Amino acid sequence: SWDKDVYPEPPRRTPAPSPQTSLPNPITYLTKAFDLLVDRPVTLVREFIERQHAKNKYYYYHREFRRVPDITECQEKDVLCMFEAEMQWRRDYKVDQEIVNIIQERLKACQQREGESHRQNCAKELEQFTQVVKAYQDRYHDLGAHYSARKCLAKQKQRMLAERKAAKEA
Amino acid sequence: DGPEKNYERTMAILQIEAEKAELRLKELEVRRLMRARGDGPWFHYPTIDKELIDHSPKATPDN
């Protein structure tokens, strides 16, 4: 139903029942009632619906965007190139936002899944979240409401210069 | 409208507005130089038409 690599999920290890009591377990009987009363009729209705969907079958596609020159290759005040470069930067900006969302979803799933052990068993999820958020902060933070590829480029050049000097301190 | 039509329609709009913008700046510069130097069609204030001069020999010879 979804990509198991984009949204990884560790294997499920469930104990086998090992009762130590003569009394009947209500959950066992209620589970059977649910499966008979709820699951099966709900399953029959879905099978009917899917049959209709196997008779009218058609497709939709994921739009593929050709890459175009970046704002770094545009001449000053050349709107025609700036426009296409700018639209591309906006598209990547929105995709980068959802990448950070994916990484945040992984972190929050891990925290719930691991329970009281989450502090130790969610280290790789927490480290990756730190790395992506750092990268996202460098790209896009502090640009303002009127952000643009031009402003994003200026922010990078300022960072590349500061890193270059700190390198030159060696 | 599809994204492509809107996208390329926008490029058509941008091209016209950028061509109008460049001409507006050139016109101001041209008007700056024509008025300051007086060597163009604009700001051409009239001087006396030399066709009004009479070159026929006059009653006296020094003129």
From Swiss-Prot, chain A:
Function according to Swiss-Prot or TrEMBL: Accessory subunit that is involved in the functional assembly of the mitochondrial respiratory chain complex I. Complex I has an NADH dehydrogenase activity with ubiquinone as an immediate electron acceptor and mediates the transfer of electrons from NADH to the respiratory chain.
UniProt similarity note: Belongs to the complex I NDUFB10 subunit family.
**What is the membrane topology noted in the UniProt record heading this document?**
Peripheral membrane protein
**Could you identify this protein by its name?**
NADH dehydrogenase [ubiquinone] 1 beta subcomplex subunit 10
A GO cellular component annotated for this chain's UniProt record is: respiratory chain complex I
Q: Which Pfam families match?
A: NDUFB10
Which InterPro entries does the record associate with it?
A: NADH_UbQ_OxRdtase_su10 (IPR019377), NDUFB10 (IPR039993)
Q: Which PANTHER family match?
A: NADH DEHYDROGENASE [UBIQUINONE] 1 BETA SUBCOMPLEX SUBUNIT 10, NADH-UBIQUINONE OXIDOREDUCTASE PDSW SUBUNIT
Q: Where in the cell is it found?
A: Mitochondrion inner membrane
Q: Where is this region: Disordered?
A: 1-24
Please name the gene that encodes this protein.
Answer: NDUFB10
Curated annotation (Swiss-Prot), chain B:
Where is this chain's protein located in or outside the cell?
Mitochondrion inner membrane
Q: Briefly, what is this protein's role? A: Accessory subunit of the mitochondrial membrane respiratory chain NADH dehydrogenase (Complex I), that is believed not to be involved in catalysis. Complex I functions in the transfer of electrons from NADH to the respiratory chain. The immediate electron acceptor for the enzyme is believed to be ubiquinone.
Q: Which family does it belong to?
A: Belongs to the complex I NDUFB5 subunit family.
Quaternary structure, per UniProt, is:
Complex I is composed of 45 different subunits.
From the Swiss-Prot or TrEMBL record, give the protein name: NADH dehydrogenase [ubiquinone] 1 beta subcomplex subunit 5, mitochondrial
Q: Which organism is it from?
A: Bos taurus (Bovine)
- Which section of the whole protein is represented? 127 to 189 of 189
